[PDB]
Design a protein around this ligand. Sequence first.
Ligand code: 1GC
Ligand code: MG
Ligand code: MG
Ligand code: NA
Ligand code: NA
Length: 326
Amino acid sequence: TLNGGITDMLTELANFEKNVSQAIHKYNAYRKAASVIAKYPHKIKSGAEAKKLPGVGTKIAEKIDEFLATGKLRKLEKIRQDDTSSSINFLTRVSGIGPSAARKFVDEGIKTLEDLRKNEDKLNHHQRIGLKYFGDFEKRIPREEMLQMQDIVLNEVKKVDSEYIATVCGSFRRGAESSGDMDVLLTHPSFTSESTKQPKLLHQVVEQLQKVHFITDTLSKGETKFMGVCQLPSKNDEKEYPHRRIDIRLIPKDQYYCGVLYFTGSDIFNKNMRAHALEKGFTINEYTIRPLGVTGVAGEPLPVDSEKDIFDYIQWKYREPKDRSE
DNA sequence: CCGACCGCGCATCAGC
DNA sequence: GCTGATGCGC
DNA sequence: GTCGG
Ligand SMILES: Nc1nc2c(ncn2[C@H]2C[C@H](O)[C@@H](COP(=O)(O)CP(=O)(O)OP(=O)(O)O)O2)c(=O)[nH]1
Ligand SMILES: [Mg+2]
Ligand SMILES: [Mg+2]
Ligand code: NA
Ligand code: NA
């Protein structure tokens, strides 16, 4: 927050391009810029200064100029005085309502959290559940609740099968003192790049978590990815904890390190690490790192036995997860 | 300059 | 059913 | 929006 003014303004700009302009690459350009300036170790005093950075071009330089001069960006005050945009933007806050659906709703006159509640019939199940818990998902999860939620998830999967390994990734694993949600990586020795031995391996863990009333809703669920809602138990007279978004991702056990790396993030750290991997001749995903053929098609998976092994291929010294928040 | 811009799971729908 | 496209996510 | 072929 030494250049937080600058970075807030850029991310606000990015959220507008994605949610309103539906210009997803304008979104990313602003996000790279805000990430670079966040990692920049001096208070910025001029647009031309910040333009040396990669990701900052001439138009972001002029906005930084204006904001340093006025403590304000004109383009942003007009985006906040447009009802339409604030309506679109706010509807994207609902889990399940992207830019496309937000725009349709407001176009058909849904503009408020009241209007959505009177029109649940216009919403799929995912959206309905993001509305049902809209206020709780706007909240942050203190790290201390994360710790309780983790204890419950790891006890309960131990119960299903002692060979499951379960790892809380996302912002939690990067050391955050509060998280947006809980991200859980799951490995079992019978789910491996060689074959899906017993298949129900994720189902069985989702089902035990529902059984004990931890998982309360399902947004989506496939064979390797579960997207749902959970809640800590509360005692007999406390106000009860807000429901929370939980994500469980079942990776093949021989690809745990790539999977852990993807799932630990941050999202922007991942796009920059995957970009620099390309400029070293590899491609990384949650499963593998592979060298690239000059044909478009990637090579064979290279052996990995630690996160740092992946940094090494692309010639980067290790970054502890707490230095991956960008 | 005009294009390129990380990688992928799950749901839905279009065309078949 | 499917491929591939899109929408909304991680 | 920025950078690069
Ligand atoms: N490569 C890649 N990985 C991503 C992306 N988005 C998320 N991930 C990976 C990295 C990301 O860390 C992980 C979980 O994503 P979230 O839970 O949505 C965001 P978190 O970082 O946990 O912070 P929180 O808001 O929860 O406090 O999936 C993406 O666009 N690309
Ligand atoms: Mg998260
Ligand atoms: Mg998540
Ligand atoms: Na620059
Ligand atoms: Na959302």
